[PDB]
Symmetry: C3
Subunit: 332 residues, 3 copies
């Protein structure tokens, strides 16, 4: 009887940050209430000023990370305001039935809907838009995110002992297929609808024009670099709704990795690079041991350094010469 | 001494169906006899009427699934009738030695051969044609299938308890590279031999023109949708002989997945999406919990919804509102 | 106190061979000293005589495999002689901090540097060049290799029992992106610097022109085929610094596979084909059971047989008819 369960309302935050939550559940099962508003907006995705018509959940690419516990109910109010132009919906890979909820959430502009589902399996999972006949166009326009379903007793290592993270970040990786004219210049449209047949032809090449973290080339750099301190335990959730990716922390490792994101499985240890298949979310746990700048990339290095799939951590603290040292600095 | 072993003759059925077999072996080791006839035929692969010259085992793409138990002998009579034009052979990834049998099975039109091999390792494995100098052309013309080698005591979960399936389907996923003229229209040839140098150039782009389940866009839909009932336990075997794939059941999960198909390993649990590397067969076990239409796709959504890698399940039974429900239907 | 530790100097050998080492450590922790010299050279990569300007560690593509034990220190003297034209450095995925050492090893021509790092995690790992702003160009010009960090008590199976290899080979797989003119012919340049903007445009297609083992089409064939004997236990280390690969031994299996290369994890058993994500090294252990020629390929068969990712083993010994036999040889 759901009506006897506590209801909690959560306000979502913008990626790469994650809304406040408890790792080990401090209550019994709850109905966890989220609201998301769909926003179609123009987005500048690179340093050259290339613009697309992005389709978003809550104004960001990716959509925000939702965090619940195993056997909570998720109740999502989904709003499509009348300033949008397209029909949208939502499919949760965490959920069971009705095309992940996609069959029950089709909202024209000016409509809203409320879906509830039980979070029966622990893990990180992708959610994304999936309207009949226009699935890849919506997804590769940025209409995807993830949800983390924590076990009620939090995360465990390969021997079943607790793993507690100090910080958590969400990296959404987006493949874009910007249409190009004959000479290779990117095209521009006034509405999303205008772009449709060009977008399909661009997708059909299977060759993205941009691959980015958090919606743009250089989004996780400079003043927007991820931060940590030496000795901190950091969980990085990474999703790709459409295309394989192979994350790698330059200068570090994935101490404990759930590459396909499902926490009833033991983690893989000591990973250099791991594969997150398209349509999956994964999670990697690392404890920082050295200060400095680290780069977090897709380790297809062309995708990283030419197409944009690279961000930075800035880590503060004490240098440990036992782990690495320059014996003779570069010299003639 | 093989001559003292029982011999059983099996008649194969067309994918996605699988020939009758026992999960737990009810006899000791046997010689299991199969016959396959090679058929080169014209195949229409999409709704536009694009035709290729397909090269098949037993008239289908994929070839039929063969099922034996660990430490059975497989004896295959392979027939290349004189109505075909090409030399063919067979390589079993389940087998040991002679290029998986490819070195011993080279048959010109008008020839036949009988190979025997011992099935020493449990798992699902790919088989495919592999003639010297023309390997990828034969494979990507549809000349591949799979064989399942069950452990003698059937399948086990991660804790070694029995997993029994009620139904089993075989999904063969095929990447085609149809040659194109200057403007982008698909070419047509009278014989397979005519297409050869154009086929190579098309393969070299590494970009398929079509990716399909069971030989055509829409083959596993409509009256050809896969069926199940709520409460049924379904094993889906999925092979890709040449290119990576990332299957996903929309609205469900892979409860127990052997993504690289080898049953001495524990399954991965609770998968949303899994990676089957090209040249591999994998297997996923799911118990249906909700009725309705489900889509089974490659979760590169362009490959699924534009290039054709999508099929349907139709599941009958009772709706469970506790798992999912529409709280407020779409409305203004 | 490092100054009290034994120092051992190792001379590296050319791939696919590996320098002499002990599987089970016969001493305590040591400082293991390696020297590598950077060589920029012209390389002929295919049977047509296509030439590139390769950037190498120690004159080979890949760079040599380095072998140490867990909790050894690696001290690398890296030399960039004044006959080279570019700035280079080295990033070890085995190491912790400073961008894997890349931040501390930037050497102009005429310079050298000595880096030391502690090998804290057991596994095979990629190393590669990674100069600021030119990372993928250096890597896809062949400037990568691997390092194996053995556990102090050698390798273990899934039940923790010793696995001892009789032989070890290193296969480095290289994706090249040779620029092409309008008609599709490969271009030629006098210096590496000349090629730069054409190289970027070629990389951006995400479509390699060649994928090769040990630096050239056909490098691991003929008199350069890998050898073994029936009954021998062979470890094959396989690295790909930039792009996914799916190795497969035609006629055999991966008995024990660490597909992502990290030895604290149990191996996957009985693999037909496995996925090594780009930016990773993996390792596969096989015991040969049949004599003959075997092909070791990337099982995207186009990448193998058209683009060049294929080599051979030649195995000597006795044929076992129980495992495979031709019952009726090909005949009318
Ligand atoms: O500004 N809407 O794409
Ligand atoms: O956007 N209508 O609630
Ligand atoms: O699905 N492409 O990695
Ligand atoms: O191929 N996926 O980056
Ligand atoms: O999907 N297990 O990480
Ligand atoms: O009809 N034979 O391709
Ligand atoms: O096709 N000859 O048996
Ligand atoms: O081998 N291509 O996924
Ligand atoms: O890249 N394989 O779909
Ligand atoms: O290959 N083991 O699923
Ligand atoms: O010959 N140096 O590229
Ligand atoms: O190349 N200078 O040591
Ligand atoms: O990163 N390409 O497999
Ligand atoms: O897609 N990697 O071969
Ligand atoms: O990464 N473990 O094979
Ligand atoms: Cu949408
Ligand atoms: Cu999906
Ligand atoms: Cu054939
Ligand atoms: Cu094969
Ligand atoms: Cu370099
Ligand atoms: Cu790297």
């Amino acid at each position: 009887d759901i009506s006897t369960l506590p209801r909690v309302k959560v306000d979502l935050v913008k990626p790469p940050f994650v809304h406040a939550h408890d790792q080990v559940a401090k209550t019994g099962p709850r109905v966890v209430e989220f609201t998301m508003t769909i926003e179609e907006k123009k987005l500048v995705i690179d340093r050259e000023g290339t613009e697309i018509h992005a389709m978003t959940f809550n104004g960001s690419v990716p959509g925000p990370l939702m965090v619940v516990h195993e056997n909570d109910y998720v109740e999502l109010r989904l709003i499509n305001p009348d300033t949008n132009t397209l029909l949208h919906n939502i499919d949760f890979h965490a959920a069971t039935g009705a095309l992940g909820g996609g069959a029950l959430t089709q909202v024209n502009p000016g409509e809203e809907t409320t879906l509830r589902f039980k979070a029966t399996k622990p893990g990180v999972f992708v959610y994304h838009c999936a309207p009949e006949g226009m699935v890849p166009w919506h997804v590769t326009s940025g209409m995807n995110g993830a949800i983390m379903v924590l076990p009620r007793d939090g995360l465990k290592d390969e021997k079943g002992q607790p793993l507690t993270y100090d910080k958590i970040y969400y990296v959404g990786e987006q493949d874009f297929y910007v249409p190009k004219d004959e000479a290779g210049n990117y095209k521009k449209y006034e509405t999303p609808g205008e772009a449709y047949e060009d977008a399909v032809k661009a997708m059909r090449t299977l060759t993205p024009t941009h691959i980015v973290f958090n919606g743009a080339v250089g989004a996780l750099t400079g003043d927007h670099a991820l931060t940590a301190a030496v000795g901190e335990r950091v969980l990085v959730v990474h999703s790709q709704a459409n295309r394989d990716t192979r994350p790698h922390l330059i200068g570090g490792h994935g101490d404990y990795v759930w590459a396909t994101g499902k926490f009833r499985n033991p983690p893989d240890l000591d990973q250099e690079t791991w594969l997150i298949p398209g349509g999956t979310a994964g999670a990697a746990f690392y404890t920082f041991r050295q200060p400095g700048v680290y780069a977090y990339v897709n380790h297809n290095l062309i995708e990283a350094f030419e197409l944009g799939a690279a961000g930075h951590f800035k880590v503060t603290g004490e240098w440990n010469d036992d782990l690495m040292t320059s014996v003779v600095k570069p010299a003639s």
